[PDB]
Ligand binder design. Structure first.
Ligand SMILES: [Mg+2]
Ligand code: NA
Lengths: 229, 11, 230, 11
């Protein structure tokens, strides 16, 4: 029963059991009924914690691997790979949900959901790109950019520049350029213009959107400061 | 040091 | 995979904050039947404390929600609490097997510190079982916890200094067992106070690392006494 | 608040 699964997802969150949380929301999505804004948030929060823990772990191991006896380096590499394979499975799960249900069921004028989900698609291809090498890397980098690009065009044409979802897209897209494409001028240009287009009308946002957008703007600023130094 | 990305949730 | 690689893996897991991995590695290390060094013993203890501790934290959240809480809703809450319960029990069972089948077993007559350390740990994981157990199952794990603590306590009193952090640490968890599990606040407070009091006089004789560990435990003893006598 | 128990590690 659908509501039990969502209830479970909420319980898992409170218990900070994010693997459970994501598995519940995965099952909910596969019912092919649309997610409400709260359900969409549960999905997004769950998988971000699941993949986020692995990204964090992967970076620790990767760094150790770099700063370090065949059998010692062999264990480090294998452990890194173990973490990589998990990260890849999680991303594949999310990307399959997005392609087969979430993006698919957005109607022509559900712009916010389209931008939300295409962004998400951009994000999890970006997480794959973080650990990928070679031709597999080219593919996930290309897929990431395409999802970001399509979400960007929708957001520019059909959403206010102050909208948290549009701002959050610009934030992550600019991060893609900086970290994945190593294109610091492109990254800064996207970040700055997004910031600039929103900052004048910030006060026109409602209470909850103003909170969300302010935070994202601060991160845009923080990234610009960091990147231009 | 690394770039900050978007929070997973909305209000 | 050789022993040192398993231990190396446990250290890597720890740095990656992957405590389920960290524990499975030290489980494997233990099962090779060679003794754990003090640092490997620390790896084992930290690993499983995090693994079981996550379950304990989760169980409390769900239990609390369950109590503040529709048949379908409440049944899912219960089922989910039980899910967490069965994980917690599986983890404790693993540790307790490690203790009974290798770690306590391979302590020789005069390896007192290790005996106290492992018997304390046995008391701990039976205590975590007791935290969620009900009925006849509960009585069994409470009695097993008490037995382990009681034996570690006697060894510690006869063969260790009152200032030793392992001894102090045992008295701490043993008094917590009395307070939280047996609801015996008088026994709890007496044990905590005497343990604290016995360690004062020669505290400055401790090695600098031991001093650090013991003063921390003594602060926890005191914090507990204050909380229990409020 | 609950009772505090022993740290899992030694120095
Ligand atoms: Mg503006
Ligand atoms: Na003995």
């Amino acid at each position: 029963d659908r509501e039990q699964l969502v209830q479970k997802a909420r319980l898992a969150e409170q218990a900070e059991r994010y693997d459970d949380m994501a598995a519940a929301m995965k099952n909910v999505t596969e019912l092919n009924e649309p997610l409400s804004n709260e359900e969409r948030n549960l999905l997004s929060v769950a998988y971000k914690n699941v993949v986020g823990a692995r990204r964090s772990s992967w970076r620790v191991i990767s760094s150790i691997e770099q700063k370090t006896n065949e059998k010692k380096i062999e264990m480090v590499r294998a452990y890194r790979e173990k973490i990589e394979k998990e990260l890849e499975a999680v991303c594949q799960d999310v990307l399959s949900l997005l392609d087969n249900y979430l993006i698919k069921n957005c109607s022509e004028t559900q712009y916010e959901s389209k931008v939300f989900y295409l962004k998400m698609k951009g994000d999890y291809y970006r997480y794959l790109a973080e650990v990928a090498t070679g031709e597999k890397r080219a593919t996930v980098v290309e897929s990431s950019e395409k999802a970001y690009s399509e979400a960007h065009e929708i957001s520019k044409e059909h959403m206010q520049p102050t909208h948290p979802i549009r701002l959050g897209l610009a934030l992550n897209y600019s991060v893609f350029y900086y970290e994945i494409q190593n294109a610091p001028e492109q990254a800064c240009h996207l970040a700055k213009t997004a910031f600039d287009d929103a900052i004048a009308e910030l006060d026109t946002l409602n209470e909850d959107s103003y909170k969300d957008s302010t935070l994202i703007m601060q991160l845009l600023r923080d990234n610009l400061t960091l990147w231009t130094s | 040091v690394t770039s900050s990305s978007c929070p997973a949730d909305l209000t």
